[PDB]
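Lab intake sheet, docking and co-folding queue.

SAMPLE TYPE: protein with bound small molecule
LIGAND NAME: 934
LIGAND FORMAT: SMILES
REQUESTED OUTPUT: full 3D complex as structure tokens
PRIORITY: normal
SUBMITTED BY: R.K., bench team

The fields below were copied directly from the construct record.
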Amino acid sequence: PTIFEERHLKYISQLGKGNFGSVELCRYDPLGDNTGALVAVKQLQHSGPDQQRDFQREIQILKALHSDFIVKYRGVSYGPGRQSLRLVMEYLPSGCLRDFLQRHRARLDASRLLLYSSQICKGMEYLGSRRCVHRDLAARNILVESEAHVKIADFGLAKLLPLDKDYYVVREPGQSPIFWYAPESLSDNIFSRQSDVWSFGVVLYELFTYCDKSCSPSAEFLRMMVPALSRLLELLEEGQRLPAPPACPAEVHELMKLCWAPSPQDRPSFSALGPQLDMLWS
Ligand SMILES: CC(=O)N1CCC(Nc2cccc3cnc(Nc4cnn(C)c4)nc23)CC1
Ligand SMILES: NC(=O)Nc1ccccc1
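RESULT FIELD (auto-filled):
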């Protein structure tokens, strides 16, 4: 049931790409009559030993995640031997939250944004409970299941923390837009559940700006600003932060600023954030 035959997976279109991977819309069509269910299918864009090790890790992480707020693992398709060729996941036609916010902004009030915030927070609370660091939390990596339901996706950079260590150090620079990284990530490539909280603060910013490009983190940096990464680290060290989005509830902007505490140990846990978002929502 969790094993998909390659010859039954019919290619339809590209859904997205990044971090050496593509996600394709396929039909799983064993009848070959175009009546089969649609699935989102991730594969490496091209072969590579390091990317393959990372891909098998991603499959093993997502397979073991069971949450209303995490994109659903369906199964795998196999290449030669035990080599995973494709990761088969549920298809969410509404696509990424970034796109959904830009298109439907006139329809989505503060209450709805707080509902999405609460759901992402509950997803991240669960990830933390599994000792999983996402490392790439952003509105582009959150999917819309329905009007009132979002799910976290994109576990391509996710890592499991050992039982005796609450952070990990990456050797090579990140390739994600720099405006979502915590200062300790920008400076020393240190990632933790607390660096995911920093990124969640930027996701709250994205939600309450409806991902408007004109007040994007990039746009704000270029107005607020030496290599860009060093300049951003300097601004953050000075205590400069993204401004309150237009018409943003003061309490929501206060929560963003707590997520952006300079020291990771001073940032609120997702467990602490959850009730505060739920309180604002109702
Ligand atoms: C922004 C970007 O390039 N991304 C890569 C592709 C990713 N898409 C999905 C990954 C995993 C499971 C998915 C299930 N459904 C969908 N649906 C969908 C519809 N339109 N789009 C763009 C995505 N995407 C998934 C979103 C982020
Ligand atoms: N977290 C936060 O406020 N980041 C930031 C600051 C200035 C420009 C772009 C991003």
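REVIEWER NOTE: The first helix runs from residue 49 to 63.
SIGN-OFF: pending second check by T.M.
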